[PDB]
Amino acid sequence: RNTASPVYAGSTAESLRGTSAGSRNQMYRLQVIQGAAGTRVRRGKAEYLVSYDNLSAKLQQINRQGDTVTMISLA
Amino acid sequence: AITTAASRLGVAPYNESRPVELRPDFSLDDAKMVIRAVYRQVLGNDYIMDSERLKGAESLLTNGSISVREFVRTVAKSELYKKKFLYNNFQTRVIELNYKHLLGRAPFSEDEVIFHLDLYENQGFDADIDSYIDSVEYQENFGENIVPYYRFNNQVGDRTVGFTRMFRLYRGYANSDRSQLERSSSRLATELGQNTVSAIVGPSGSNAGWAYRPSR
Amino acid sequence: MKTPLTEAVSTADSQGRFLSSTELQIAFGRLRQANAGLQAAKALTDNAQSLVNGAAQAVYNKFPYTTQTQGNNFAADQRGKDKCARDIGYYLRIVTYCLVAGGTGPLDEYLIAGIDEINRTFDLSPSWYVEALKYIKANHGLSGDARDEANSYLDYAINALS
Amino acid sequence: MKTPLTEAVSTADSQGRFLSSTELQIAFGRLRQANAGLQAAKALTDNAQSLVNGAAQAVYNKFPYTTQTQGNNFAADQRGKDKCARDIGYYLRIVTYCLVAGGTGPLDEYLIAGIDEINRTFDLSPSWYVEALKYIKANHGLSGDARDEANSYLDYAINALS
Amino acid sequence: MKTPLTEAVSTADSQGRFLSSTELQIAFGRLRQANAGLQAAKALTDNAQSLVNGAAQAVYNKFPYTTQTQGNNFAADQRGKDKCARDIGYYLRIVTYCLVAGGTGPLDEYLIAGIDEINRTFDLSPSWYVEALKYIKANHGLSGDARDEANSYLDYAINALS
Amino acid sequence: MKTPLTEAVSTADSQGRFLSSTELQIAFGRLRQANAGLQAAKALTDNAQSLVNGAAQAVYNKFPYTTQTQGNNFAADQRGKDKCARDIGYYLRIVTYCLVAGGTGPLDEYLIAGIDEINRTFDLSPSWYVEALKYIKANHGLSGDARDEANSYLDYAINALS
Amino acid sequence: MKTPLTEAVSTADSQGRFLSSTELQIAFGRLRQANAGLQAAKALTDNAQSLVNGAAQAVYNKFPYTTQTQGNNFAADQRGKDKCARDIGYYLRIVTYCLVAGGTGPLDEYLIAGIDEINRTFDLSPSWYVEALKYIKANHGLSGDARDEANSYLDYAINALS
Amino acid sequence: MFDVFTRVVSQADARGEYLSGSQLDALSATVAEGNKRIDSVNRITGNASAIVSNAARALFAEQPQLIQPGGNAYTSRRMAACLRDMEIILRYVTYATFTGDASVLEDRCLNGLRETYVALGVPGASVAAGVQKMKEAALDIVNDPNGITRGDCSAIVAEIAGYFDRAAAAVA
Amino acid sequence: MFDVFTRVVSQADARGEYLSGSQLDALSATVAEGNKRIDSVNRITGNASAIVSNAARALFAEQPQLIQPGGNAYTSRRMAACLRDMEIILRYVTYATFTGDASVLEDRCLNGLRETYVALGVPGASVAAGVQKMKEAALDIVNDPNGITRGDCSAIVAEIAGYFDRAAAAVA
Amino acid sequence: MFDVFTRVVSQADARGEYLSGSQLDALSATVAEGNKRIDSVNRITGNASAIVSNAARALFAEQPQLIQPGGNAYTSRRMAACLRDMEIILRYVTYATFTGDASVLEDRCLNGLRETYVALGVPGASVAAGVQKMKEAALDIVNDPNGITRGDCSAIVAEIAGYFDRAAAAVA
Numbered sequence A: 001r002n003t004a005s006p007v008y009a010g011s012t013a014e015s016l017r018g019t020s021a022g023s024r025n026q027m028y029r030l031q032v033i034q035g036a037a038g039t040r041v042r043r044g045k046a047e048y049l050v051s052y053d054n055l056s057a058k059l060q061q062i063n064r065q066g067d068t069v070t071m072i073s074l075a
Numbered sequence B: 001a002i003t004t005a006a007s008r009l010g011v012a013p014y015n016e017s018r019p020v021e022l023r024p025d026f027s028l029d030d031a032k033m034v035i036r037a038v039y040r041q042v043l044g045n046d047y048i049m050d051s052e053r054l055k056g057a058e059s060l061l062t063n064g065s066i067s068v069r070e071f072v073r074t075v076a077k078s079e080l081y082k083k084k085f086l087y088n089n090f091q092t093r094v095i096e097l098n099y100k101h102l103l104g105r106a107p108f109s110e111d112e113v114i115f116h117l118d119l120y121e122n123q124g125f126d127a128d129i130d131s132y133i134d135s136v137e138y139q140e141n142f143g144e145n146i147v148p149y150y151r152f153n154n155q156v157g158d159r160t161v162g163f164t165r166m167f168r169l170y171r172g173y174a175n176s177d178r179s180q181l182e183r184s185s186s187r188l189a190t191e192l193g194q195n196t197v198s199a200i201v202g203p204s205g206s207n208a209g210w211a212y213r214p215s216r
Numbered sequence C, D, E, F, G: 001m002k003t004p005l006t007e008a009v010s011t012a013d014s015q016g017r018f019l020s021s022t023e024l025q026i027a028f029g030r031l032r033q034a035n036a037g038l039q040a041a042k043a044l045t046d047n048a049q050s051l052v053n054g055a056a057q058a059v060y061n062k063f064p065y066t067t068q069t070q071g072n073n074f075a076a077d078q079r080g081k082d083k084c085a086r087d088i089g090y091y092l093r094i095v096t097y098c099l100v101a102g103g104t105g106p107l108d109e110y111l112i113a114g115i116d117e118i119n120r121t122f123d124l125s126p127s128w129y130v131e132a133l134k135y136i137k138a139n140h141g142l143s144g145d146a147r148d149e150a151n152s153y154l155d156y157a158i159n160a161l162s
Numbered sequence H, I, J: 001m002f003d004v005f006t007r008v009v010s011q012a013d014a015r016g017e018y019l020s021g022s023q024l025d026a027l028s029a030t031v032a033e034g035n036k037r038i039d040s041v042n043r044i045t046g047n048a049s050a051i052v053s054n055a056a057r058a059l060f061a062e063q064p065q066l067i068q069p070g071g072n073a074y075t076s077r078r079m080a081a082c083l084r085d086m087e088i089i090l091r092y093v094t095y096a097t098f099t100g101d102a103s104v105l106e107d108r109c110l111n112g113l114r115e116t117y118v119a120l121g122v123p124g125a126s127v128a129a130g131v132q133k134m135k136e137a138a139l140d141i142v143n144d145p146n147g148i149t150r151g152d153c154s155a156i157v158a159e160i161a162g163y164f165d166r167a168a169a170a171v172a
């Protein structure tokens, strides 16, 4: 489709944890393609940062809405 | 909607407000409005002192490191929230407060008390908080980027008992959840157990009989 | 409020758990500390009038304009002097509570929460109180664990003011 | 930034609405005000050095200890005096931005947000800057709408510091 | 309601702020507008019966089936004609409220919100009311600011229906 | 797409449950209906041109102004008649999908969602399509379960339009 | 309770929807199953005493320690045997409710929810009840749809225990 | 919520008893009426918009105070809310008809509705009049002998009338 | 929330009437006083911190029981909350002055406030005294003849006094 | 999510065509096999716990590294998460069998599952081996000729094997 993607190589994948990264202090970055099939959708491509404890719940949320997961990595 | 009785019931200010949304590429003022909106909603309009502010969570929210929902989850799991609403309350009162703060509505049925009481007892407070925020109801109303707000108006999936119980938990604009006549007592323990409701008593100022409360 | 016993039960209660060896260890830490804290509270209480009066005079010496300048926020008259000695007494008394409770809880609840708004609204300099707290640190005469815990609360208040 | 045009659009955007007669009236209000703000900004800009130096001396006169007391937070040396003149220059300059913008947005974004932490951290007294702002009000020489708007921002800063 | 004064206060309240020069400018914009709005409201009111009757006949001329077709939603009988004149009177009356208020608030709260449900449920064509509104635009005889504000509300209603 | 099979799985998935006897009964319900639905789709498909043309003429007869009035939203020229016949074909075709799917899902996702904005934007009367659907109901010639399911979807469309 | 009819309304209500052909098909599925379920419930009820005692003896045969080992959780005495026959009777009775209800609802709400904590708390092996349920499956004598639905509920209980 | 089957089950579990032969036979008779029950739901649903709009028109004609300025059904917001309420009540009546039990209607719709309308100033008696008008139209629709296998639906119609009566009683 | 214009509109709509010539003329007179109204709002806002702090100092001087140990204004948190209350009430009074209608005060500031103070044990009579002190300072500030185009502001001052009296009455 | 019916509908709508006689006949053949489809779903579901546990035991027997200390399935929570994942995959395979379309499995289970396991360090090749073990057990259960009307279930068995194959390929 003649487009680019963000670069998450080396340490560029890292994101700040603080006290918001759950019990394991790990963040997961979910890149998705989404549309409006609920709240208004503002962007066709979105990123979500969720802790390990909420990673399962987030996948079902993305799944229930019919949105596509393009990449998941540790942040 | 609520038009004629809106001011009498304390709903008129919320009729005049719009959901607070954090758009992509948000500005500085956008982040501040979210933080103010989250603190007012999630902490039940209690005054928040500078020493009590979650400066780290505010920083991550401002930076885009956490979304609005994750900021709400961080506030709800904080020691500030637990001090205000957990450590000094019956868990049914805690469940009442969680529904108002995080879902903007009152509990509908005893089944909700059963679910969240067991979830807290088996998995702990943090697990219970996740259940509200990761719920389908939270997803459909607020999603990732909108601060929770009171849902006074009728929506799909509502029950009428929810409307009457909202004014058991909401007691006016110039008021906080920790500054109501019933104080720490559960407002809906009896109503949920018996599946009963009570006549709506509006807030003080606009209603002379605002203080009516039944006895044991 | 933040004390070892309250924090221990607050953690277990948040987790919906019985108390475990972790919480029992917290209690043992409290017991190791408690007697020294009670000794410090007694020593500060018996010496409170001298510490408060000396602390107020130390502030006046370091900031002589406070006793020379007219204004509701200054101690040029007996009214302001009485307010000042009252405030320093509040710090000293609430510090003794921290020693009894074994934590900053009393300071957090009774004094520090909202102190910034008070000092701004009434045009009170936090530097004045920092000087008073430093005087109490240098003059309470405690030693050992009593000194360490007492100075931790005095420095805790100083840091909150700075 | 709080300005009449930005708030008009942001409120409409939050409602998902085209602009209506309400927002156009906001624009007319800005247009009635804008020239007075620009002239006020010009007058303050042209007189900036006299106002800043006069304001700094007003502070030193009202609080003589600032020029007599050693310390990083005081103006007993040229280092401290230069910092103080710089700070007062920041207040005046950002006030002219508010006159240009038609609102407190420049003051809110550039100066007021976080000022309490800075003054607490660096032991700077808000009363010093209040005195500097009061001098600027008493000496900018504006009249009419220019005076009223300029004083609203100077009083806005004073209230933020108090 | 969406009016300059109420929205100015509600926005400031949401931000927890006192009214500033931004909100004062909004008030000045309202004051610049109000007399023309009140004059426009008077002119529409004095001519209401002619405008309503003229608007109704314009609809009947443009859509003759509404006067020849049997049905609850049509004006083939005096019942339907009376319902139609009443409805157009509601549009005109609420438009005069918008001129008095200086915003779309009265139209939003009394008429526009839920109008789509009404027209769908009772099988009323929005095109009918668009024609009535266009007639009123062409015949109210206003000029200047009065014309512009009045037409903005009439066009606001037309856009909502289309 | 709302169908008995997808709704059965969605409900189970929302509960994190395997499919139980409840969902197997839903499948048996689908299998009871499926052949009648497939028969109905074939009968409507084989008769589609006659139904669309007859339905279009029914609308023109009931609403003669749609064939006499100039305008992009009317069928006074061949362009609009082709647009109208196309639209009615869309309704009939998507109804046959509902019969194939055994639910309103194809109507919900392809036609109903957004129809209100389309009709308002392009000034199309829902009453036109209601008449077209009523003609198809009166003329598809089905019976038994085929009729009842087909009429449910046609009535579903009519209710959505009113 | 989870049944086809309650699930159909629950899904429709959550969508704010009138019941459509999808939910009607769910009802037809229930009606297809209902008579076979009622016959199965009758057959199990009439044979219940033999099934319960036979199942209990099957458990005792497979796990002879249950009838030889002293303890509150075992069936070495008449007390424990009575508890065991009671529990097996509860399983069988609630299964008949599922056949009546046409879903796992009665099992979910009366038996399955909380069974894990009970078995852990009172030191009861889930394997004991699995064997009892297997005996009932092999001995209820049902055939056809009655057999398939009943075995689905017995298997559902077995799966919950394993 | 309960349906016709699970209502009897719940009462049986509370007594710790298997369903009796008479209870099972009664539920079999309910199954034998299932097609008529499904037709009744289908017919009301298929005419839902007409039932609500005709009832609303009849109500406002008989009670013109509701729609005059200052009336509780005056303005588009309130009129839209009013029409919505009628559709909601009708929707839950069909739910109860579908399940053969009033619990879904009572639990989710009627419980608290009197208190809601009193708080809002909605005239509950007028709602009851509107519900009654929907009842007559719906029952006529259910009873229409055209285009359906002929038989006796008096029992189903009586049950539906009961649910409408529950709704009318609850609002006032 | 209403302003001075929409208050009249709402009453007119509930009657289904156009505003009369007298009502439009009355609103025209309100517009003629608009500059005085804006000035009063500006003057109170520009002195908000002084009005709050001076009133608070006077209240605690006359009621030392509020700030002694055990008093409701003792401890920094309660004291800060008390100062916030005074600022909030003053802020909403300026809103009412700006809009020309008390609704913003009634709908938001005073809505549930008595419940808050009764629940917390805040002495409402003492809040009323503090509000009275702010009123005295505010009216003097509004009336200051210096540095402003001279004219009669008695009408706006009387209106502002009423908003202060409303707030004081709502708490005690 | 699509089922066997809506899959054909969606393709037809994209071309703006009615389903052809051949397509309708194909769906009629699908309807004729529905009872076998329901039996296959019922049999897999009725043995779900056994299928998962037997597959898990077999997997750890051939891949003991998974359960040795430091292995990805070592510790109770990781083992529980692994058994959970196996049950999830089996559940969504039954969903696909029930609907006759793989969309539910692909959209709601396999969507991003390969990347999730990579990010977590879960060995996907071992997940695939476990899924294959569940596959062979499930197909024998579906194919069991005892206690069922005799007939040819080869087509449904092939379809179910396809869904298991999709799950195994997606993870690894």
Ligand SMILES: *[C@@H](C)[C@H]1/C(=C/c2[nH]c(/C=C3N=C(/C=C4\NC(=O)C(CC)=C4C)C(C)=C\3CCC(=O)O)c(CCC(=O)O)c2C)NC(=O)[C@@H]1C
Binding pocket: D036, D144, D145, D146, D148, D149, D152, E021, E024, E025, I032, I033, I034, I035, I036, I037, I038, I039, I040, I042, I142, I143, I144, I145, I146, I148, I149, I150, I151, I152, I153, I156
């Ligand atoms: C009672 C309130 C006091 C008082 C007021 C008063 N003001 C005016 C006139 C004006 N005041 C303003 C105000 C502003 N101009 C600005 O640019 C801003 C800043 C954003 C403000 C607040 C304006 C625009 C006018 C009109 C022009 C003028 O300067 O006169 C009057 C005169 C009558 C009038 O309504 O115009 C009065 C009476 N006067 C007193 O004596 C009271 C103490």
Ligand SMILES: *[C@@H](C)[C@H]1/C(=C/c2[nH]c(/C=C3N=C(/C=C4\NC(=O)C(CC)=C4C)C(C)=C\3CCC(=O)O)c(CCC(=O)O)c2C)NC(=O)[C@@H]1C
Binding pocket: F144, F145, F146, F148, F149, G021, G024, G025, H032, H033, H034, H035, H036, H037, H038, H039, H040, H042, H142, H143, H144, H145, H146, H148, H149, H150, H151, H152, H153, H156
């Ligand atoms: C009172 C309600 C009226 C009435 C009803 C009635 N219906 C039947 C029989 C059937 N009705 C249906 C219904 C449907 N078939 C479908 O495919 C669908 C669409 C999803 C529906 C709603 C069915 C399946 C039957 C059975 C077969 C048949 O066509 O007859 C009867 C006959 C008795 C029975 O219970 O079967 C009756 C009485 N009849 C009237 O006269 C009332 C006005």
Ligand SMILES: *[C@@H](C)[C@H]1/C(=C/c2[nH]c(/C=C3N=C(/C=C4\NC(=O)C(CC)=C4C)C(C)=C\3CCC(=O)O)c(CCC(=O)O)c2C)NC(=O)[C@@H]1C
Binding pocket: F021, F024, F025, G144, G145, G146, G148, G149, G152, J032, J033, J034, J035, J036, J037, J038, J039, J040, J042, J142, J143, J144, J145, J146, J148, J149, J150, J151, J152, J153, J156
């Ligand atoms: C491959 C899957 C195996 C197989 C299946 C098979 N089944 C039938 C027929 C039926 N199966 C059912 C199923 C149920 N009845 C119920 O009440 C329930 C419980 C909710 C279920 C799951 C039904 C209704 C039938 C029809 C009646 C009958 O028993 O025959 C067939 C026959 C063909 C058909 O499609 O009807 C087949 C082939 N048979 C095998 O040999 C495989 C091992």
Ligand SMILES: *[C@H](C)[C@H]1/C(=C/c2[nH]c(/C=C3N=C(/C=C4\NC(=O)C(CC)=C4C)C(C)=C\3CCC(=O)O)c(CCC(=O)O)c2C)NC(=O)[C@@H]1C
Binding pocket: B001, B002, B003, B004, B005, B006, B152, B153, B154, B155, B158, B159, B160, B163, H066, H071, H072, H073, H077, H078, H079, H081, H082, H083, H085, H086, H088, H089, H108, H109, H113, H116, H120, H122, H123, H126, H127, H130
């Ligand atoms: C119409 C015949 C009459 C009428 C109705 C009317 N109702 C309201 C407002 C509400 N109605 C409800 C009721 C429900 N909400 C639910 O979720 C359900 C159960 C699922 C029911 C039955 C509620 C809660 C409200 C308030 C919240 C909201 O409207 O969203 C109004 C508007 C009231 C107002 O605007 O103040 C009206 C007009 N009024 C009449 O005069 C008729 C007799």
Ligand SMILES: *[C@H](C)[C@H]1/C(=C/c2[nH]c(/C=C3N=C(/C=C4\NC(=O)C(CC)=C4C)C(C)=C\3CCC(=O)O)c(CCC(=O)O)c2C)NC(=O)[C@@H]1C
Binding pocket: B090, B091, B092, B113, B114, B117
């Ligand atoms: C056991 C000895 C007796 C008994 C108990 C019983 N309790 C309930 C239900 C509830 N129990 C509670 C209790 C608490 N909630 C809290 O927040 C706290 C402190 C943290 C406590 C102690 C609550 C709120 C409920 C309601 C929700 C729930 O059902 O779990 C039941 C169930 C009653 C019912 O389902 O209707 C029972 C059985 N019952 C006995 O017979 C024993 C004497």
Ligand SMILES: *[C@H](C)[C@H]1/C(=C/c2[nH]c(/C=C3N=C(/C=C4\NC(=O)C(CC)=C4C)C(C)=C\3CCC(=O)O)c(CCC(=O)O)c2C)NC(=O)[C@@H]1C
Binding pocket: C059, C060, C066, C067, C072, C073, C074, C075, C076, C079, C080, C081, C083, C084, C085, C087, C088, C090, C091, C110, C111, C118, C122, C124, C128, C129, C132, I057, I060, I067, I073, I074, I075, I076, I079
């Ligand atoms: C002493 C170092 C200097 C000084 C003191 C001074 N303080 C005030 C007024 C107040 N002081 C406080 C502080 C507290 N109140 C509490 O409850 C507690 C926590 C338990 C504290 C620390 C407060 C709240 C006030 C304002 C209310 C009151 O007066 O009680 C004054 C008077 C200020 C005024 O404008 O009235 C003074 C003079 N001033 C100096 O110059 C000393 C060096």
Ligand SMILES: *[C@H](C)[C@H]1/C(=C/c2[nH]c(/C=C3N=C(/C=C4\NC(=O)C(CC)=C4C)C(C)=C\3CCC(=O)O)c(CCC(=O)O)c2C)NC(=O)[C@@H]1C
Binding pocket: E059, E060, E066, E067, E072, E073, E074, E075, E076, E079, E080, E081, E083, E084, E085, E087, E088, E090, E091, E110, E111, E118, E122, E124, E128, E129, E132, H057, H060, H067, H073, H074, H075, H076, H079
């Ligand atoms: C006139 C252009 C055409 C026309 C009108 C017509 N309208 C109705 C019925 C209603 N009109 C309204 C509209 C409003 N009610 C309000 O409160 C407001 C907001 C303030 C508006 C705009 C409503 C709600 C109704 C329905 C209820 C009622 O009758 O009041 C009818 C009758 C429809 C019916 O079925 O009874 C008619 C005839 N019809 C034409 O043909 C004209 C071209």
Ligand SMILES: *[C@H](C)[C@H]1/C(=C/c2[nH]c(/C=C3N=C(/C=C4\NC(=O)C(CC)=C4C)C(C)=C\3CCC(=O)O)c(CCC(=O)O)c2C)NC(=O)[C@@H]1C
Binding pocket: B045, B046, B047, B048, B173, B174, B175, B176, B179, I066, I071, I072, I073, I077, I078, I079, I081, I082, I083, I085, I086, I088, I089, I108, I109, I110, I113, I116, I120, I122, I123, I126, I127, I130
């Ligand atoms: C000061 C003159 C007096 C005083 C005040 C006091 N108030 C509180 C607590 C609260 N005050 C409010 C009021 C508002 N909150 C709002 O959002 C609004 C505007 C819409 C108003 C008017 C509320 C809600 C509270 C409770 C929330 C909170 O966090 O405090 C206190 C604190 C009491 C306590 O126990 O902490 C105090 C001290 N007290 C006096 O003695 C003076 C007479």
Ligand SMILES: *[C@H](C)[C@H]1/C(=C/c2[nH]c(/C=C3N=C(/C=C4\NC(=O)C(CC)=C4C)C(C)=C\3CCC(=O)O)c(CCC(=O)O)c2C)NC(=O)[C@@H]1C
Binding pocket: J057, J060, J067, J073, J074, J075, J076, J079
């Ligand atoms: C010993 C008291 C009795 C006994 C044991 C037994 N256990 C298994 C299998 C497993 N045991 C575990 C337990 C753990 N795995 C862990 O990682 C940890 C936490 C660090 C624990 C406690 C697990 C997970 C299994 C299954 C997987 C595996 O095989 O490792 C078996 C075999 C069960 C089977 O079906 O293969 C047995 C025999 N059995 C007795 O009879 C003893 C009295």
Ligand SMILES: *[C@H](C)[C@H]1/C(=C/c2[nH]c(/C=C3N=C(/C=C4\NC(=O)C(CC)=C4C)C(C)=C\3CCC(=O)O)c(CCC(=O)O)c2C)NC(=O)[C@@H]1C
Binding pocket: A052, A055, A056, A057, A059, A060, A063, J066, J071, J072, J073, J077, J078, J079, J081, J082, J083, J085, J086, J088, J108, J109, J113, J116, J120, J122, J123, J126, J127, J130
């Ligand atoms: C078992 C055969 C293998 C294995 C599994 C394993 N998985 C995890 C963790 C997760 N698995 C998932 C997958 C899903 N979650 C869902 O909700 C669904 C459907 C949408 C799927 C497919 C997820 C999201 C996680 C992480 C979050 C969570 O566990 O809730 C683990 C634990 C990993 C860890 O402890 O960090 C394990 C052990 N591991 C093996 O070695 C086997 C080959």
